[PDB]
Amino acid sequence: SMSVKKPKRDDSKDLALCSMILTEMETHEDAWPFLLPVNLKLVPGYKKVIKKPMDFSTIREKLSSGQYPNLETFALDVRLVFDNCETFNEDDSDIGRAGHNMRKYFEKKWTDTFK
């Protein structure tokens, strides 16, 4: 509260570390469904159904231009990528499996880096 603060957590490496994690996700073999925005002209249903599209390229541009105020807003966009994937894709599809694998991969790097 006013003039009463928890001790200051060092957040000065967060930007760099989120970039590293993002590099690792970009270079994973199962990243291909997620590298670029879904083409809303060519994929029936996507525009109406997925209210907040997100992809790794869009996260990378936001990261590079100071549009994440903190590491939690970064994690929200990453998870949004996988949540959208589960909304639109059957679990037993290549893309549906990719998304489960990538979420797993991300959540481990996240815990190991920050928790």
Swiss-Prot record:
Subunit structure, as described in the record: Component of the BRF-1 ISWI chromatin remodeling complex, at least composed of SMARCA1 and BAZ2B, which regulates the spacing of histone octamers on the DNA template to facilitate access to DNA. Within the BRF-1 ISWI chromatin remodeling complex interacts with SMARCA1; the interaction is direct. Component of the BRF-5 ISWI chromatin remodeling complex, at least composed of SMARCA5/SNF2H and BAZ2B, which regulates the spacing of histone octamers on the DNA template to facilitate access to DNA.
Organism in which the protein naturally occurs: Homo sapiens (Human)
Compartments where found: Nucleus
Function as written in the Swiss-Prot or TrEMBL entry: Regulatory subunit of the ATP-dependent BRF-1 and BRF-5 ISWI chromatin remodeling complexes, which form ordered nucleosome arrays on chromatin and facilitate access to DNA during DNA-templated processes such as DNA replication, transcription, and repair. Both complexes regulate the spacing of nucleosomes along the chromatin and have the ability to slide mononucleosomes to the center of a DNA template. The BRF-1 ISWI chromatin remodeling complex has a lower ATP hydrolysis rate than the BRF-5 ISWI chromatin remodeling complex.
Residues of the full protein shown: 2054 to 2166 of 2168
Superkingdom of origin organism: Eukaryota
Tissue: Expressed at varying levels in several tissues, whereas a smaller transcript was expressed specifically in testis.
Family of this protein: Belongs to the WAL family.
Domain named Bromo: residues: 9-113
Protein name: Bromodomain adjacent to zinc finger domain protein 2B
